[PDB]
Amino acid sequence: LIVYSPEHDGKELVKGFRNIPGVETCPVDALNLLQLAPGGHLGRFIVWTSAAIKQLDAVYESKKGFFLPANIVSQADLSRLINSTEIQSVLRAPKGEARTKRAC
Amino acid sequence: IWRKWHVKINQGQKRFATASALAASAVAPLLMARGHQVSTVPEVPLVVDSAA
Amino acid sequence: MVAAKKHVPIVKKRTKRFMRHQSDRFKCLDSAWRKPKGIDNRVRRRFKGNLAMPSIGYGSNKKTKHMMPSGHKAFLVHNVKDVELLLMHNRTYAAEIAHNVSSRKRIDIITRAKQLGVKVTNAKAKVTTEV
Amino acid sequence: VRYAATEIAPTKSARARGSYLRVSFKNTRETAQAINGWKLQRALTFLQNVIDKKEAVPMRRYAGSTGRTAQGKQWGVSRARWPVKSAQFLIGLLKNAEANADAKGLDTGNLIIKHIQVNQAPKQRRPYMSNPCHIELILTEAEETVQKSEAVVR
Amino acid sequence: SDEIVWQIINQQFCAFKLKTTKGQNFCRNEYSVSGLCNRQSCPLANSRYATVRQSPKGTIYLYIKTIERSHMPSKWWEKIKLSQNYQKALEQIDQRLQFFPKFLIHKCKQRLTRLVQVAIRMRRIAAEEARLGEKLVPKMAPKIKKREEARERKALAAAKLERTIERELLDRLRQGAYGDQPLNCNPQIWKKVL
Amino acid sequence: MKVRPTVSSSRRKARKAHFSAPSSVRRVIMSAPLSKELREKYNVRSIPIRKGDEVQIVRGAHKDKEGKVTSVYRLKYVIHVERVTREKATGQTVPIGIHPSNVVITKLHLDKDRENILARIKAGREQVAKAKGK
Amino acid sequence: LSRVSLARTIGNKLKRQQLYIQAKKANSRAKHEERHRRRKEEAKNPELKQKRLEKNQPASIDKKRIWDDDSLGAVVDVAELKRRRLELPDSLTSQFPNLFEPPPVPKILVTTGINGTIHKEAEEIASIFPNATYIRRTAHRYAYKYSVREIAKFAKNRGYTALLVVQEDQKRPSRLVVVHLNGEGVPPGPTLTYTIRNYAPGKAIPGHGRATNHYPELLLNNFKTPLGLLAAKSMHILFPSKPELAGRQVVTLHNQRDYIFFRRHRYVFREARPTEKNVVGADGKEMEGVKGIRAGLQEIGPRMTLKLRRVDKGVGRAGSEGPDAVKWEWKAKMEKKRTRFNL
RNA sequence: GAGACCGAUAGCGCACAAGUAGAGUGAUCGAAAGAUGAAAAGCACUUUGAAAAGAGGGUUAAAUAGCACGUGAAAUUGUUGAAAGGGAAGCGCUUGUGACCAGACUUGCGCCCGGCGGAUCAUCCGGUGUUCUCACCGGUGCACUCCGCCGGGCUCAGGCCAG
RNA sequence: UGAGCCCGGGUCGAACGGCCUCUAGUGCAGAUCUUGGUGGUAGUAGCAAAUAUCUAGCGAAACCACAG
RNA sequence: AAACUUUCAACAACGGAUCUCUUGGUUCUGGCAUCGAUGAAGAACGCAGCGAAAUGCGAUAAGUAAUGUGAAUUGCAGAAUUCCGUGAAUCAUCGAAUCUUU
Numbered sequence A: 001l002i003v004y005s006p007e008h009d010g011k012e013l014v015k016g017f018r019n020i021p022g023v024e025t026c027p028v029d030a031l032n033l034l035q036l037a038p039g040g041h042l043g044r045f046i047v048w049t050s051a052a053i054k055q056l057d058a059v060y061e062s063k064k065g066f067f068l069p070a071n072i073v074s075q076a077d078l079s080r081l082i083n084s085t086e087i088q089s090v091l092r093a094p095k096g097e098a099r100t101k102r103a104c
Numbered sequence B: 001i002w003r004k005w006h007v008k009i010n011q012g013q014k015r016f017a018t019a020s021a022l023a024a025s026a027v028a029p030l031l032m033a034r035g036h037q038v039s040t041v042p043e044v045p046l047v048v049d050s051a052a
Numbered sequence C: 001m002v003a004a005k006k007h008v009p010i011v012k013k014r015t016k017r018f019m020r021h022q023s024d025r026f027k028c029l030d031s032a033w034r035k036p037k038g039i040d041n042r043v044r045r046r047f048k049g050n051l052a053m054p055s056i057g058y059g060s061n062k063k064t065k066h067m068m069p070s071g072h073k074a075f076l077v078h079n080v081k082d083v084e085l086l087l088m089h090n091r092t093y094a095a096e097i098a099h100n101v102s103s104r105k106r107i108d109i110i111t112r113a114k115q116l117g118v119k120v121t122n123a124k125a126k127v128t129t130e131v
Numbered sequence D: 001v002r003y004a005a006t007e008i009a010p011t012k013s014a015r016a017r018g019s020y021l022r023v024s025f026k027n028t029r030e031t032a033q034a035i036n037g038w039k040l041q042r043a044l045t046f047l048q049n050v051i052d053k054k055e056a057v058p059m060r061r062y063a064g065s066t067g068r069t070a071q072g073k074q075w076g077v078s079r080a081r082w083p084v085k086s087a088q089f090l091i092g093l094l095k096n097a098e099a100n101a102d103a104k105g106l107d108t109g110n111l112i113i114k115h116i117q118v119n120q121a122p123k124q125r126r127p128y129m130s131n132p133c134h135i136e137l138i139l140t141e142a143e144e145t146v147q148k149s150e151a152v153v154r
Numbered sequence E: 001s002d003e004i005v006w007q008i009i010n011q012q013f014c015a016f017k018l019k020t021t022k023g024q025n026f027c028r029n030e031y032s033v034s035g036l037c038n039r040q041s042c043p044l045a046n047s048r049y050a051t052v053r054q055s056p057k058g059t060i061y062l063y064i065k066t067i068e069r070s071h072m073p074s075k076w077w078e079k080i081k082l083s084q085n086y087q088k089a090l091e092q093i094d095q096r097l098q099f100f101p102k103f104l105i106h107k108c109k110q111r112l113t114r115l116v117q118v119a120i121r122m123r124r125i126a127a128e129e130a131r132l133g134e135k136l137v138p139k140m141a142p143k144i145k146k147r148e149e150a151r152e153r154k155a156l157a158a159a160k161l162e163r164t165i166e167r168e169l170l171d172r173l174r175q176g177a178y179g180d181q182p183l184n185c186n187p188q189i190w191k192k193v194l
Numbered sequence F: 001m002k003v004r005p006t007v008s009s010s011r012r013k014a015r016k017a018h019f020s021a022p023s024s025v026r027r028v029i030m031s032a033p034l035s036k037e038l039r040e041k042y043n044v045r046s047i048p049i050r051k052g053d054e055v056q057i058v059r060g061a062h063k064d065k066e067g068k069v070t071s072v073y074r075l076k077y078v079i080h081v082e083r084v085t086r087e088k089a090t091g092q093t094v095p096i097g098i099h100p101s102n103v104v105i106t107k108l109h110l111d112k113d114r115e116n117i118l119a120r121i122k123a124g125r126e127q128v129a130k131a132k133g134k
Numbered sequence G: 001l002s003r004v005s006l007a008r009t010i011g012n013k014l015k016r017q018q019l020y021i022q023a024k025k026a027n028s029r030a031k032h033e034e035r036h037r038r039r040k041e042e043a044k045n046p047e048l049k050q051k052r053l054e055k056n057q058p059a060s061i062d063k064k065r066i067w068d069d070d071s072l073g074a075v076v077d078v079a080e081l082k083r084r085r086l087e088l089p090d091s092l093t094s095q096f097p098n099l100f101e102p103p104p105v106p107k108i109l110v111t112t113g114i115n116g117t118i119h120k121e122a123e124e125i126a127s128i129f130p131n132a133t134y135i136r137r138t139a140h141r142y143a144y145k146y147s148v149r150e151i152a153k154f155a156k157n158r159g160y161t162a163l164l165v166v167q168e169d170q171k172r173p174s175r176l177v178v179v180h181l182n183g184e185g186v187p188p189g190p191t192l193t194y195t196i197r198n199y200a201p202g203k204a205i206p207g208h209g210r211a212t213n214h215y216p217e218l219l220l221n222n223f224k225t226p227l228g229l230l231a232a233k234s235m236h237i238l239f240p241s242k243p244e245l246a247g248r249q250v251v252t253l254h255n256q257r258d259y260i261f262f263r264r265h266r267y268v269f270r271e272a273r274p275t276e277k278n279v280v281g282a283d284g285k286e287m288e289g290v291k292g293i294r295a296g297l298q299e300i301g302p303r304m305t306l307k308l309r310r311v312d313k314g315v316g317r318a319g320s321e322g323p324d325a326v327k328w329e330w331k332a333k334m335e336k337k338r339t340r341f342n343l
Numbered sequence H: 001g002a003g004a005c006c007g008a009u010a011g012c013g014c015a016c017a018a019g020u021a022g023a024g025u026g027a028u029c030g031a032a033a034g035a036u037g038a039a040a041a042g043c044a045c046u047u048u049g050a051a052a053a054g055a056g057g058g059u060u061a062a063a064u065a066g067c068a069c070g071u072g073a074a075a076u077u078g079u080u081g082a083a084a085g086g087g088a089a090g091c092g093c094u095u096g097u098g099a100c101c102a103g104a105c106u107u108g109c110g111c112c113c114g115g116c117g118g119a120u121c122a123u124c125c126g127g128u129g130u131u132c133u134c135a136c137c138g139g140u141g142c143a144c145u146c147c148g149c150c151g152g153g154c155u156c157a158g159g160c161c162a163g
Numbered sequence I: 001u002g003a004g005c006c007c008g009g010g011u012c013g014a015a016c017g018g019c020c021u022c023u024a025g026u027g028c029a030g031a032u033c034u035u036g037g038u039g040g041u042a043g044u045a046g047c048a049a050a051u052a053u054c055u056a057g058c059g060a061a062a063c064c065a066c067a068g
Numbered sequence J: 001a002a003a004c005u006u007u008c009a010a011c012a013a014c015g016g017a018u019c020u021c022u023u024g025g026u027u028c029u030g031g032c033a034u035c036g037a038u039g040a041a042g043a044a045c046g047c048a049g050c051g052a053a054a055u056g057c058g059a060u061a062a063g064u065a066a067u068g069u070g071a072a073u074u075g076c077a078g079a080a081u082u083c084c085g086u087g088a089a090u091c092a093u094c095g096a097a098u099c100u101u102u
């Protein structure tokens, strides 16, 4: 997906990417979820322009009634949360192993 | 014909989904898990200069 | 030494199929099992000398479920890349070439599987030996 | 493996067919069953002696109680009848097969009726329904026997 | 975000996933050290990863992926050539994958063992097929098979086999190919011919 | 992709328009490419075929056969080349219907109107060549 | 209706069916009337029937055969080119000097594929050829896999003349590989690979017989192409040249439209029954000399069909070395036309 | 101009002769019915006979695609082969007999000599791409090391069932 | 366990399948169910609208869970 | 013994399901506004070489004129009808005409 800035790049690049099978073009001010997650599957490959990044900084402060959401988790790395000196220090000794030997 | 064909979604939830999709697009394992051939792509948010 | 893994002996609790009640009499009734829903149906009430119904007690051991008599599990393959996925599972899985695979692609799959040490169930398909 | 009984050579057989024939299926089937397995000239004389009235055709499966005479003593069936049109159609197909065997180069004095099959034809849409039939008969030659020669010593 | 991409891969959709009805899922990714979809074997949901792959030349390499090149899909893997000596290659895997998870080390040794065993088996198989000379070829296609069946039926009809044999035997009997006093036929039959 | 709203990408309408076309539209549809030498000579790629052209068949079981077009059967959407015929059961030699897309015109039946067609096509191609050059 | 399809002109199925039925009635009645009138005029004038018969001949694919305008693959007639030269075989005897100074008595070794299951079928095929022994190729399941070249060398060292390999498909015979081992200092010779398609043992044949130990006589019919001459000679060397005529046994390999029908009969020269006709000769009736004499035949051997698929220089593909590795290979595109035969 | 529609018992009653055929004094009621083949190349000719029919023979990639035409289910029917039965058949569990069909572990690795050839061997030389320390080529040679290939030698491991 | 699924053999001739989601005119043994096709009765009753016996030709209907 | 009845397999029938197809339907959307006493909608009778149906047309009758294109129509039969031409066509456009009985 080609994301461009129509103010700084113009709309002539839309014509040159039209016939190439598969490639799509979208302005940075009118991004489409149907194109960013095709089929409901996340992770679309995107070629940006430089002006696309600068106006991508710009247009998320211009939406009225919307601010960029704050996550309920600060550090999403669970291995950093659990395997850290902070938590490992207060942990009681293990009560068993991953595999329990059969007693009788 | 008076079946409900269209779905009203809150604009806040649509902007949340668009921002989540944009954030997911900057992660390369998600790009290959979606099915994109990016093994020769130098950086996942593939920024090219506007002069090109 | 090349065979399947060491596995516990394969025990089938029942080898026959569960036929639908009165399906041998009517040609409009397929033999696929349907649970009887009538109140006085003696198959449903489990009277003596009648059909048994499928129960969870008839289930197979989890260590030998889905396992062929040779000890392998069937793995459906459509191309050569699919048999390559059994490089590390040559003793646990056997290749089952799909029914719509052409002859030359079948030759490619059989050749690669032999090199990988993977058994093919239908290697006597539309191929023949040339001297 | 098991091998099926191979067919006899096409140079030793002669086939005749008749399709969508306007005769009753049951009477034609019984007439064909009566002459099944016989020699060709015997079947010719029987059908010509059932077209003009001397000889009877017994019925076993599609048997209707119509006549009870002595002509069924030779077949062991107490129910005997005389269909006429089925005899004419069987006669026509038998001379057709005779012409086919004469053209092919078979000895017409040693022809036997290997098999004769009467199948049902599509019903004539006119509630009264007609019952046409297909007939497929195959005549063969009598099996030939050759005396062996004594084996040689080595 | 290893856990978040793992949740997205495992619970929603992955293009490298083969779901079988036999109790195991498989990973179609080429860099998977074991072709199984589970948490430890995922090449995508693990930022630090290691696998062992064999080139078409036959040289076997160890591929190592770190988190600091994770935004560089063209620079994800560093490739290290493994020795032809099996024990020295095992020690090379031990030396390069130091301080890695033990699962990755164990699966790398197992994959190297299986690749060397497959190479030896391939050499033995190639020698055996070179000695025997056998080769699998496709059977006749259904159109060609139908063509041969129909034309063989027509050729058998046009052959007139028994008539041809009888005619050629009578022709051999006429021209004296069996000689005077033939052992084939009765003396009266030979008298009638003359 | 089509942009003009008057164009239809319907398979149904396209098939109906193709198989229920008038004779002049069928003439336009039954067109054949020119040979390489004629393409460099007249600067024209393809022309509607006509009786009297000499063609070479480049597709089908009658490949590399040459001959003069003796019939343009627009109803059956086929042309009849000279000596590319068949045999019936009775022995009659019937022509074999070859689509005009399967042949290449090696010699044109040059009249005044055909020269006008060639001139118009050449003028359009050269004016687009001028537009591309500058 | 010989030029027009009613299905492509009438859009209604029922109307087209009614029109076709009426056309069949009219055409059948007119054709029967025309033939009855013609027969009445043949009865009036019995001379123009002969001109009608000699002018209106039925067609045959054999007469429509396409030849070529000689080296192992040219579709030519050797006898007719020979008669052209009398009024351009040498390439065959140059390429195959061992097959083409009489050959010795043949000893045949018959085997199967690797894990062969056709033991009775291969034993019967060996029982076809005089002086033929059948040896299995693997003994048990997990023994040594001998190659065709090794077995050919082993049988060459033991005095065998030729090696026959019967290859199975679905537990039925499918391919026949004939290798000529030659003798003295000559290497093992050409390899001919045929396909067995319609195999039936003697028991399957209704009204059959049991063969004896007499040497049969060969009826190799309709071989004209140099490839066909090579196949006929390869079948000829497998059998002894002198047949024991006391036991009237005939082995027939008849080539028709590239298909070689193999049969085996026993015969007797008997007097004709008075309803039998005299035997018609080829291209003209009344076989001169045997009018009233006919041959009775009884099948004592298997019915099989062969089609030559490959001719190799050595023992198979692995064994043929130089640029003249394969002598001839069958391709389906060579049977693109139904009147083109390779023999 | 289109569709997350229907696909010939569906979708308009009507994909085709459809408000037609046909019914009713009339107002009105109102069907069934699509597919040969790429191309008719729509089966010449010989021979039975009175048929909307056959046998040879031909066209076709194919006619068991022949204007009864793509494929061709079941109900129901005929020919052949096998088995059983004559005061019901059919079903569940368990052996036996006959016929037919399948074919068990895909059946390997490691050491010790001799010869040969390559290299990740040579602190050998030159070049290329790089994540800048890892890969890939080209040329040298076998002192060491490591791989293979060939000829000998030895050990071991091997699937199932009985006692 | 099961609803089911996979492979072999034959026929055939132009499209189709798995997985993750979405969607619905989505699963039949019965409704004196609808439409089509096909039976025993039955070559029987009778020769009747349409098309006093024996023998040719023509030839139904009621009824039918399976049998006495 | 033979005959009959039942089950299974192969082949051959009956029948038209399934699969695949679709110049058809159905639902939505957009531009536009145009029947008739200057005789409408509808009904009937006729016009072609072979016309059964459908369609077109009206005694100028599967049509005439004018314009445009540029070499056919076509199932069979016929044309000395036209191919550097005011010119084929079961062609398209269409401004001029003909237009039976109701």
Ligand SMILES: [Zn+2]
Pocket (backbone or CB within 6 Å): E009, E014, E016, E017, E027, E036, E037, E038, E042
């Ligand atoms: Zn995964």
